[PDB]
Amino acid sequence: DVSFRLSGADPSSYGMFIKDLRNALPHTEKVYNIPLLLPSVSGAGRYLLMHLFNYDGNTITVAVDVTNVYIMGYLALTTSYFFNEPAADLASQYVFRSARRKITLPYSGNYERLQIAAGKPREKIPIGLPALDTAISTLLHYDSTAAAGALLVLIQTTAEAARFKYIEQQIQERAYRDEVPSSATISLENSWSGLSKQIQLAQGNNGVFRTPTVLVDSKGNRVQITNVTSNVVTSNIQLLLNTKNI
Numbered sequence: 443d444v445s446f447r448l449s450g451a452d453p454s455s456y457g458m459f460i461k462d463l464r465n466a467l468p469h470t471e472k473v474y475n476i477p478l479l480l481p482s483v484s485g486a487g488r489y490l491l492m493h494l495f496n497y498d499g500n501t502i503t504v505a506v507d508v509t510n511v512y513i514m515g516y517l518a519l520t521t522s523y524f525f526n527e528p529a530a531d532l533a534s535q536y537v538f539r540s541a542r543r544k545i546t547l548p549y550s551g552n553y554e555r556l557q558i559a560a561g562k563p564r565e566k567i568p569i570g571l572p573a574l575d576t577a578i579s580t581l582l583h584y585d586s587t588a589a590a591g592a593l594l595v596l597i598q599t600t601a602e603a604a605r606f607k608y609i610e611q612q613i614q615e616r617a618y619r620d621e622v623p624s625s626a627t628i629s630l631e632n633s634w635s636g637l638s639k640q641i642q643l644a645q646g647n648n649g650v651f652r653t654p655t656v657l658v659d660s661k662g663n664r665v666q667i668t669n670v671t672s673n674v675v676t677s678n679i680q681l682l683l684n685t686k687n688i
């Protein structure tokens with residue numbers, strides 16, 4: 443398990459949490475020095491438990507699929523909640539079985555569906571450590587519309603930060619003040635599967651992507667990533683989705 447406490451949190455303690463979260467994900471192989479997530483994991487070992495504490499010390503436990511860093515569901519006191527999708531229903535066979543009741547959320551966990559349920563795009567939702575504190579608080583008591591926005595914050599401040607050093611840094615900058623994600627942040631989230639696949643295909647292709655990946659840079663400029671010498675590959679991405687899952 444990994445834990446993060448918002449009470450007394452700062453950039454250093456958040457970085458320790460993102461480090462812990464990366465390190466809790468199993469891998470047998472690095473590609474271009476980036477850990478390659480596993481094709482699959484059988485049984486309960488598929489799911490990592492993240493214990494998150496709001497400023498007041500109230501807690502939820504979030505279930506994360508270690509093959510893809512997808513959030514499946516969470517437990518808040520005696521109630522479990524799971525996205526409405528086959529992978530989360532499967533997770534519900536393994537985690538939080540001691541909950542007194544299980545609520546299936548009225549949406550799947552993908553960004554498209556969550557944004558529809560929240561009523562706004564990611565572009566308009568501030569993120570940061572204060573927003574994460576709020577998100578944990580929101581998830582403590584069921585409200586499916588509020589929860590969608592809380593989950594958009596939670597996924598970006600945990601999973602997306604684990605995947606990209608740039609996103610981790612973006613949250614550290616927002617330790618005491620929320621701000622909507624940069625366009626670069628959104629671009630990276632949307633491109634993780636594609637980047638992961640191209641970095642793997644580059645092995646066997648002399649470091650060259652079979653298909654270029656388009657990203658937005660820090661200046662708001664659209665750029666083509668065509669090979670493993672790019673800063674995105676050498677100094678940003680921290681985990682690779684296995685091509686067996688793409």
Ligand SMILES: *[C@@H]1O[C@H](CO)[C@@H](O)[C@H](O)[C@H]1NC(C)=O
Pocket residue numbers: 650668669670671672673
């Ligand atoms: C590889 O990527 C870098 C950008 O980091 C670029 O300057 C270079 O032209 C690219 N080379 C090939 C062969 O794609």
